From Swiss-Prot, chain A:
Quaternary structure note: Component of the mitochondrial small ribosomal subunit (mt-SSU). Mature mammalian 55S mitochondrial ribosomes consist of a small (28S) and a large (39S) subunit. The 28S small subunit contains a 12S ribosomal RNA (12S mt-rRNA) and 30 different proteins. The 39S large subunit contains a 16S rRNA (16S mt-rRNA), a copy of mitochondrial valine transfer RNA (mt-tRNA(Val)), which plays an integral structural role, and 52 different proteins. Associated with the 12S mitochondrial rRNA (12S mt-rRNA).
List of residues that carry N6-acetyllysine: K71
Biological function: Mitochondrial RNA-binding protein that has a role in mitochondrial translation.
Disease implicated: Combined oxidative phosphorylation deficiency 51: An autosomal recessive, mitochondrial disorder characterized by intrauterine growth retardation, low birth weight, poor overall growth, progressive limb rigidity, delayed psychomotor development, hearing loss, and optic atrophy. Brain imaging shows abnormal bilateral signs at the basal ganglia and brainstem. Patient cells show decreased mitochondrial complex I and IV levels and activities, and generalized mitochondrial translation defects.
Record protein name field: Small ribosomal subunit protein mS39
Encoding gene (name): PTCD3
Tissues where the protein occurs: Abundant in testes, skeletal muscle and heart tissue.
Family designation: Belongs to the mitochondrion-specific ribosomal protein mS39 family.
PPR repeat coordinates: 94-118
UniProtKB/Swiss-Prot annotation, chain C:
Gene Ontology biological-process entries: mitochondrial translation
Family note: Belongs to the universal ribosomal protein uS3 family.
Lineage: Eukaryota, Metazoa, Chordata, Craniata, Vertebrata
Protein's UniProt name: Small ribosomal subunit protein uS3m
Signal peptide: none
Domain of life from the UniProt record: Eukaryota
Known partners and oligomeric status: Component of the mitochondrial small ribosomal subunit (mt-SSU). Mature mammalian 55S mitochondrial ribosomes consist of a small (28S) and a large (39S) subunit. The 28S small subunit contains a 12S ribosomal RNA (12S mt-rRNA) and 30 different proteins. The 39S large subunit contains a 16S rRNA (16S mt-rRNA), a copy of mitochondrial valine transfer RNA (mt-tRNA(Val)), which plays an integral structural role, and 52 different proteins.
Keywords: Mitochondrion, Ribonucleoprotein, Ribosomal protein, Transit peptide
GO molecular function, one term: structural constituent of ribosome
Organism this protein belongs to: Homo sapiens
From Swiss-Prot, chain E:
Any one GO MF annotation of this record: structural constituent of ribosome
Any one of the GO BP annotations: mitochondrial translation
Name this polypeptide is given: Small ribosomal subunit protein mS33
Protein's cellular compartments: Mitochondrion
Chief location: mitochondrion
Swiss-Prot record, chain H:
Taxonomic superkingdom: Eukaryota
MF terms in GO: RNA binding; structural constituent of ribosome
Protein known as: Small ribosomal subunit protein mS35
Keyword flag Methyltransferase: no
Subunit structure: Component of the mitochondrial small ribosomal subunit (mt-SSU). Mature mammalian 55S mitochondrial ribosomes consist of a small (28S) and a large (39S) subunit. The 28S small subunit contains a 12S ribosomal RNA (12S mt-rRNA) and 30 different proteins. The 39S large subunit contains a 16S rRNA (16S mt-rRNA), a copy of mitochondrial valine transfer RNA (mt-tRNA(Val)), which plays an integral structural role, and 52 different proteins.
Amino acid sequence: EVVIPKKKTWDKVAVLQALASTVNRDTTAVPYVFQDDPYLMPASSLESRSFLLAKKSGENVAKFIINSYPKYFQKDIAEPHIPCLMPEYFEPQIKDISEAALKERIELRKVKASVDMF
Amino acid sequence: VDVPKDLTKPVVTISDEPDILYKRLSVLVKGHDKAVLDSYEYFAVLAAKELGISIKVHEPPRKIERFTLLQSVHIYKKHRVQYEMRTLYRCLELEHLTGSTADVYLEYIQRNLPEGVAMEVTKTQLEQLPEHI
Amino acid sequence: KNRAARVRVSKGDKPVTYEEAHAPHYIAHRKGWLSLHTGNLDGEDHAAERTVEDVFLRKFMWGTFPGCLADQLVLKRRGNQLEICAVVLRQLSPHKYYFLVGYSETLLSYFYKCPVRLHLQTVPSKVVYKYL
Amino acid sequence: AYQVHGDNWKFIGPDQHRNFYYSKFFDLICLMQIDVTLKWYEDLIPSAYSQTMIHLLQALDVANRLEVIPKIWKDSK
Amino acid sequence: SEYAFRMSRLSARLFGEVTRPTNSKSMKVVKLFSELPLAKKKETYDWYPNHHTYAELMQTLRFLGLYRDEHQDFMDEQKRLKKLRG
Amino acid sequence: HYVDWRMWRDVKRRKMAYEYADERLRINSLRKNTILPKILQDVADEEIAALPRDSCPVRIRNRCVMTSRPRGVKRRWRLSRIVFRHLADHGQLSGIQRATW
Amino acid sequence: SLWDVEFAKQLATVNEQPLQNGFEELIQWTKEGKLWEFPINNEAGFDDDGSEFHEHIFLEKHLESFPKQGPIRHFMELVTCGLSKNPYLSVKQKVEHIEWFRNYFNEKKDILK
Amino acid sequence: RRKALPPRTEKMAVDQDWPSVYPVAAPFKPSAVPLPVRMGYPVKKGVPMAKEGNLELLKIPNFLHLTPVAIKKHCEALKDFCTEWPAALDSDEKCEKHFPIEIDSTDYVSSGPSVRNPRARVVVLRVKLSSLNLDDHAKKKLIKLVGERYCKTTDVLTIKTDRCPLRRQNYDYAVYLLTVLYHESWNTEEWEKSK
Ligand SMILES: [Mg+2]
C-alpha cells in the first residue's frame, strides 16, 4: 500500500566523526594547533614545547582574569547559556555552619575545612 | 605510505518510527557577490547530483537599498553623498526528498556555507489526516 | 575637492598599501570589505551590534599586537564561527606572538561567548602598493 | 615496528614519550633498501621532529644513495 | 445582516478574537497587549553595550600593561607637562 | 564611562522606561479604554500623573553610540551619519558601496 | 561517587591529547556545545517550560471570579485576546498580568457600577 | 635575527591530496598554497601584487577547500548514510493523494553568536476541500466562515499560524483548530438554517 523509510537518530558529534574519518591525516604538515606561516612555524621540539606552553600560560592568565573580575563577563549575551563560558565562583558565603559544610565539598581546599571543624 | 587500516565509522540506529517525508525543500541564498553565489550554487548542485536527487535553478532579481547622507559636516544641504547595499538572491528547489537525506544534506551545506551569505529554508512536508477529524 | 579615506599626493616619499592607496568609491569595484557578515542584508538584524563589536575587536587587537601589524584586518564570521586574519612583521619573538594569540583568543571567546579563532601571516617588511 | 604502528593515538600524550617513540621508530627503520624508509620519512618530517639524523646518515651511507643526503641536511638546517 | 454577524461571531470564537462587538478604543487593549511596548523592546533595553564595562576593562588591562593605549599615553604625557609647567 | 552626562541621562531614562514599561502599558490601557467608568479613567490618569519623572518612553532619544550625536542617526545602525560615512569609506563594515547608479 | 569521579577525571586527563585537524576542533566545539547543532531550529533550548498552545490562548481557566456580562468581563476578555495574539510572552507572564488586574480591581472594588 | 623557512611550494609535489591538506574552511595561507594566483589592480605597465602580500585574496571569501574531488569523496562517504525516497511517490497528484495535508515552516540563518529570531515561529498549511469534506452543508458552512483563507481558482484552503512563539505550539494549535473547525462545521444552528 505505502512504503515509508524508517527514522534514525544521530549524535551531534557523530556526523562530524564521519566527516573526519572520511579524510586522512594531513601529510607533510605540522599539527593543526601550530600556525601555518613559516616564521611562526615551530621548527624544533624544545621551541614547540615552549610555544604551546606559552599558549597554555595564556589560557591560565585568561582563567585568572575571569575569576578575578567575573562581573565583566557576567553578561549572558549568547542565547545558549554555557557554564563553561560563565565566570568561575570559589567564594565562601556568610557564616553558616550547615551551608558552609555543604559548601566545603564545593570549594575544594583545606583551610575552610579546618575552620569548619573548629 | 601511512594509510589507515580500518576507518572507524559512527554508529547509526534505525528508529522503529517512520521518517518524515519532505515534499519540497526550497533554499534561498542572499549574498553580495554574484560570483560567490554562483560558486555556492555549483557546489550545492554537484552535491545534490552526487547524492542522487532532483534539482532546479533560477536567479531571482537583484534588490537594492540606498540612502543619502550629508557629504560635509556643518552647512551643505545640496552636496550629498549616496550609498547602497545590493542583495542578490539565488533559489534552489529539491523535490521528493527523505527526512534523513534532508538532515544530512542541510548539515553538510550549513557547515560548508561561506561567510557573507544568509540562508533561508522553506520546508514543505505532506501528512495524512488526523484521527479526530 | 573630497577628502575621505585617501592619501595626499606627496613628492614620492610615502609608501602606501593597496587599501590605503585606493579610494573609498573604489571599494566594491577594486577592493573587498574588511568584515563579512549578514546583518547588513535584508531581513537580518543586530547589524549595529556587529559593527560595534567588530570595531572594538579591531582596536583591542591592534593595541594588543602593537607595532607588528602593517595593514587592516580580515574578519570572517560564518554562522557562529568567528575567524580573524592578520598580516604582521617578525619584530618580536614567536613566544610572545603565540602567548598574545592565546591571550586574545581566550579574552574574545569569554567576552563574546562565541567560538573565535585567528590566523597571522608573517612578512619581513610591509608590502607597498606605490610610493606617492 | 609495523605491527606496533581507531582512536588509539591518544595514549602517546606527553611530548617526551612521543619523542622517544618516534626516535626509536625511525632508528629501527634506518638500521633495518631504504627507499620506502625515506619515503615514510619525507612524508612525516613536517609533522615529526641529532641522533636520528646520525642514524639517517649512516643508513644513507650503507645504502650508497649519495644524492639524498644534501636534501636531508638542507631540511635539518 | 444577522446571518453574517453570527458568522463573524463564530469565526471570532474559533480564531480567538472577540465575538461580541467592540470599538477601536476597546481594541486598543487587544493590540496593546498583543504587541509589546517600545520600552520593553530589546532595542530600547540595550541601545549599546556599556562603555562602563569597555573602559573599565581597558583601563584595568592597561594597568596590567598589555594594551599600549596611544591616546592614554598622549593624555598622560600632556597632563605631566601641564602639571610641570603649572 | 559613558561619553557624557547627556548620554548618562539618556541611559537612565531608557532603564527607567524599561523597568516601568509594563506598568505604564497596563495603566495606559486602563485609561484609554472606553466602556469602563470615567471615574476609573480619571483614577488611572491621576495614577499616571503621580508616576515618577523620566519613566515615559518619549523623553528618551535615539542618540548615537559613538559620538553622542542625536540628529543624523539611522535607527538600523544606530550610528551617526559622519561615523557611518567614515566606516563605509574605510571599508570597516560589510556590503556597502557608493551609489553610482 | 566522589572517588569515582576522581578516577574518571584522572582517566580523562590521561586520554586527552592535542588534536591535529579542524574537524577535531569542531568536534570539540560541538561536544562542549558552543558550535550550533545543525539543523538550526532556532529553538535548541528555550522550550517555554513545556508550555502548551491552549495554556497560552484559552484563559477561561484563569477567568473565574467575575460573571460574563460586565465591563470588567469586557476588559479582561480583551486582555486575554491580546495576550493570546502575543507570542512574545508566555503563560507565566499572562497569569501575572491577570493576577495584577485581579489585585487592582479587588482593591478598587469600591464602585462596582 | 631569526629567519623564516621558505614556503611549502617547492615541498608539495604534483601528486597531492588537496582534500586532505585542506579538510575544512580556512584562509588562503599563501605559504602553504603553491599557486602563483595574484589579484589586484596593476599599475601602468605593472602587475597585480604577489600572493604573499595579497591580502585581498583573504578579503574575498575562500573556496580552496571543498574541491570537486573532496565533494565527490564526501558524497561517496555519506551515500551509505543518506536514505532513499519511495518510488511510489513520483508525482504531485500521487503524493497529495497519499498525504493531502500540506504543511510548511521556515527560518533564516545568519552569522553571529545568537541564533533565536522570532520569524522561526511562523508556519502555514494547506488542504484542498475537493476530496476531504465529503459533504455539501458543512462545505458551504466552512466556505462562509473562512473569509480569504481559500482560493477557488486553484481550489486550496490555506491557513497560517503565528500566535505562538514555538514551532510545535503553532503546529499542534493549527491541528486542534482544524479539528474543532471540522467538528463545528459538522453541526448547524437554527439561525443558520434560516437564511
Ligand atoms: Mg562634491
